[PDB]
Amino acid sequence: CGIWALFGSDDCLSVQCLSAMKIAHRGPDAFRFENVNGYTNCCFGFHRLAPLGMQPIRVKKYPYLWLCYNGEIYNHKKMQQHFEFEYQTKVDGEIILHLYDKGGIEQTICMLDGVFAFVLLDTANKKVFLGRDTYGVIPLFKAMTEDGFLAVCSEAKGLVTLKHSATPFLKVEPFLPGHYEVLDLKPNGKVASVEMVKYHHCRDVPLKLFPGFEIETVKNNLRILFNNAVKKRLMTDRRIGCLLSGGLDSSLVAATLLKQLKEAQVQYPLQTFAIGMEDSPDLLAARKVADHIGSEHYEVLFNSEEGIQALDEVIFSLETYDITTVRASVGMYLISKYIRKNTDSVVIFSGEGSDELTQGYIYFHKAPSPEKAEEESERLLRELYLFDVLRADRTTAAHGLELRVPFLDHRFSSYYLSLPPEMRIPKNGIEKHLLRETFEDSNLIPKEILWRVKNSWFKILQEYVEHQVDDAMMANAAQKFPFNTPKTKEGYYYRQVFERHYPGRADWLSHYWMPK
Amino acid sequence: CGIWALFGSDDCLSVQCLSAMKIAHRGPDAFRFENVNGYTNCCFGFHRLAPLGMQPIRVKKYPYLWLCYNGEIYNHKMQQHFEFEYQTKVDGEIILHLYDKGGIEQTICMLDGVFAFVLLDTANKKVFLGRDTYGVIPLFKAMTEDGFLAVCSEAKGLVTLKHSATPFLKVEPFLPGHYEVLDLKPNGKVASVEMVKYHHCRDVPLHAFPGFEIETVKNNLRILFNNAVKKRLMTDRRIGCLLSGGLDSSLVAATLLKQLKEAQVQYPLQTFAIGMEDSPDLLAARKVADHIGSEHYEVLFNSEEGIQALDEVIFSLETYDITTVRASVGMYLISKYIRKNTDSVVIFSGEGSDELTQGYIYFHKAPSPEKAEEESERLLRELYLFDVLRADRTTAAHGLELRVPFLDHRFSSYYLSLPPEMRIPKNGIEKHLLRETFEDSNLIPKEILWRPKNSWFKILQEYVEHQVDDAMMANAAQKFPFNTPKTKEGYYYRQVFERHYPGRADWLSHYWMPK
């Protein structure tokens, strides 16, 4: 789904509908453009994927509450029962209105375990509220003007097109994950920012066994939390698939997903997807996992020409120029296109965030101290809304598909980060040793995968960019891209394409990778 | 309230949204712009006039029915007769409750009120377009041979539309009294299937003295006029009136005030009269207001504003007819004054009396009463272009509403069913039956009931005399081949209309027939 708001508008709302429709790829099934009574300058916009729920949500009990949200709140039945809240509509996000009425904005955002990005408007109290998930899933982009012009969109493609007269420059920036912004609605449609507070994560009480921090009492808790995350991500009326990259995280996610699906009396078989080159070891591992679990495996053979042609599309969708995310997202875009075309699975489960939480990266072997490794992991999790969640989310949503990341749930990630740093660090030369040990006896995935001319894909990209980028431009790039100057030709070409699609807005990224 | 629906659109939808906002003046409170699931090419748009609804009506009992209408029916509270539960607070949902009951022919023939609706049935794969018998609520359709369809309220919301597959699209006013059925092809585009008239009264059997003697007809006419005013009274907005100083406006104002007093209405009636300084029409309006006690607001509009409002009047009225523009200048000014310095939205006016009651001066020179009846029926059929068109385009242009009490289905059917001798002028005075009907109720002073019948045309001609050169009137036969203006005023109106609406000048076939 795609949310969109235009609180404050000196221009007409018809010239500003093209920007709203620029994110129509998120849901190509419905679209509603609606204004707000008394504040006709401010409007809304929603896109839906897959009967008679739509947005904005205006309920009879709260006539002054206007909510435009996209994502999934998993603990809505566990809270509509704890506090009786009659829901007029079948929308998952209706509980946000009730929680806001009951206890304001601070308590309506800390009890939404799940992924979400919402815009809330209160005419009675004359206030506007924004929100994003604590890890950056379900992104949000905000554009603010000193006059009081406010814009919010799911992606940045819906804000750069927007025209605001009486102000030459409009600043479009990604909404900081884990934050809520309270702004005051002036009686002319404009807004004035009143506060911006980070609510961090939470460890919800209404969600078994959590004795302490012993080795045998940690693996059991990790298993319980992972299974609970998969179970709570299961809830949906749409088909669920999986992306088998061949790694430990994807294999564990697929195995647990299959087990919980079988426990949920689900009729459709699970569809696991793998993308790679011919006879690649990753594809072999994915096929081994699929055969071990018995899932409908769909292998996609990567051809370099398709990636070369789709470089521009993936740069446009991802809205970034970082080399690593583009290289890792070209294949994800292709596999999402294949899933949309040849299969009927929309909900996609991936093991994104495991490497940045379970110390899964190679350079973590060179951490001077476990505390440094923990700090690096926390920093990666904070900056996850720009590198991997962006790659796993924008590319997935570019084809009308939904993303689920069980490794990025609040409870399991919080418990893993609360573990002593001596346990998260690699122990016997293998990264993420604790996660591998926690599933030794469950027999979820084969043992050889549990504990585990060279990669001839980046060579094609390197040679293509080298042929397409001149050395004189690279020398000139110091005075051509003053902010985040590319150091290689690949970065230069990615930046060139990104500026061609988005001119002058390159502040969305400030670093690349690898703090060895 | 304005409605704007697209079917079979191929040139996206965001670039086609700016055409809908051209009718935002009808309702400036809210605005919706929806789509059709499975038919993304099709889209809907509603402009609401003022708490929680919009009119892409989808009722959970009929998930495949999407209705958009801009009007108000007076027979919905048929709900008691049919025991039809209504999910929403709108009075158009019953249309769906009727469409499943008996189709579209029976639904549109039992709607007592003004309406122009578009309905989409996905299950039956059809689109239905409807308009009232006298066309009080406007409706304009633009259809291409490819399958494109654009149904709006006014025409200003369709001339902006773009067809990337056809150079020219024909925007024509939907006929007043027809229902149109179109087959919904899978590609969103719609072909043309059927278009049948439904005419007039068929709802009076299933909802609420024979003879033609002079007393019985008078009693029946009084009863029907009172019933029309009473059924038009129902609304949540304030009710005003336009005191033109004539018989029809005075009668409507008196009956409206009497019913409002019978309705325990707290707010006083607001009667508005626009005219020149010290004019007989304004004096008559003041006399009527004093006799009935309504709060009277008088506007002494000067020639400068009327001249400066000619462009906007022609833009809103979408016509180049001389008389329509002449009356529409004053109607537009009085509507602007009403919106600006008054909280009254619903307006009552006698638009349809001079045609249905044969109250024009030239009706005296009638070759026969049958000829007069035929002329009156011809005027009623073309009423959606001259008088109703102005009374709607100059009212909805300021976020107001028009409630014509004289063009009631039962009242018109009974008046037109009378012998032609009674309708014709009796003693050299037109509308004799209407005047005799209310001669005992003491609604309005006798000096105004009788005595049948302000220099604004002269300044209009003076302004448009040094604006159309004598050379520009010589080539009018080669500059405006269709409906060539015979006067300089008509040439000015036509040039303004062409500047606002280029090429699409076939909406008005004739100009106006005084005989």
Residue numbers in the entry:
A (entry chain A): 1 to 50, 54 to 55, 57 to 211, 220 to 464, 476 to 539
B (entry chain B): 1 to 50, 54 to 55, 57 to 81, 83 to 213, 222 to 466, 478 to 539
Sentences from the paper on this structure:
Arg-142 is conserved in mammalian asparagine synthetases, Sequence and structural alignments, however, show that that cognate residue in Escherichia coli AS-B is isoleucine (Ile-143) even though nearby residues are conserved in both homologs. We were able to determine the structure of the R142I variant dimer at 3.35 Å resolution by cryo-EM in order to assess the validity of these MD simulations. As expected, replacing a polar group by a hydrophobic side chain had little impact on the overall structure of the enzyme (0.483 Å RMSD of WT vs. the R142I variant) although structural changes in the tunnel region are observed that will be the subject of future computational analysis. The N-terminal entrance to the tunnel linking the two active sites is open in the EM structure, similar to that seen in the X-ray structure of the C1A AS-B variant bound to glutamine and AMP. When L-aspartate was varied at saturating levels of L-glutamine, but in the absence of ammonia, the kinetics of PPi formation showed 4- and 2-fold reductions in turnover number for the R142I and R142A variants, respectively. In addition, given that the gate to the tunnel is open in the two variants, as seen in the MD simulations and in the cryo-EM structure of the unliganded R142I variant, ammonia trafficking is expected to be maintained at the WT level and so have little impact on steady-state kinetic properties. Replacing the positively charged Arg-142 side chain by the smaller, hydrophobic side chains of isoleucine or alanine, however, clearly alters how the C-terminal synthetase domain in human ASNS responds to different nitrogen sources. More importantly, these calculations raise the possibility of a role for Arg-142 in maintaining the structural integrity of the tunnel after formation of the β-aspartyl-AMP intermediate; this finding may underpin the observed kinetic properties of the R142I variant although additional experiments and simulations will be needed to support this hypothesis.
